[PDB]
Structure 1
Amino acid sequence: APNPYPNGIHFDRVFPTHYDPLAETNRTKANLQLIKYAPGNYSTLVVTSEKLPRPCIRTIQNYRRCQM
């Protein structure tokens, strides 16, 4: 799997590590007592939307239909 895109977000456990994702080629494994990395090793930023309830959609369809 490719090396995850550099992400400076990390979470310390014992002492501050000052993790720099640009200081190493391959990301070192996360030791329990040292660091936890950010979620989504392989993730992108998108925009999504919730799907409104079906009965609420039918009331909107009936309003537009009665409107036109």
Structure 2
Amino acid sequence: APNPYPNGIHFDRVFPTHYDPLAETNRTKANLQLIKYAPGNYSTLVVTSEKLPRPCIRTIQNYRRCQM
């Protein structure tokens, strides 16, 4: 799997490690007492939307149809 894209977000456990994702080529593995990395090793930023309930959609369609 490719090296995850550099992400400076991390969470310390014992001491501040000052993690720099650009200081090493391959990201070192996360030890339990040292660091926890940000979620989504392989993730991008998108925009999403919830789907309105089906009965709420049927009333919107009925209003538009009755309107036109």
The TM-score with structure 1 as length reference comes to: 1.00
Name the CA distance, whole Å, in 1 between partners of 2:4 and 2:31: 17
User: Could you give the per-residue CA deviations for residues 11-58 of structure 1, whole angstroms, max 9, x where no partner exists?
Assistant: 000000000000000000000000000000000000000000000000
TM-aligned CA deviation for residue 2 of structure 1 = 0.1
Name the CA distance, whole Å, in 1 between partners of 2:50 and 2:64: 21
Name the CA distance, whole Å, in 2 between partners of 1:3 and 1:43: 12
Matched-pair identity in %: 100
Q: How many residues align?
A: 68
The TM-score with structure 2 as length reference comes to: 1.00
- Unaligned regions of 5+ residues in structure 1, if any? none
RMSD over aligned Cα atoms: 0.1
- Runs (4 or more) in structure 1 with deviation over 4 Å come to none
SS of residue in 2 equivalent to 1:36: strand
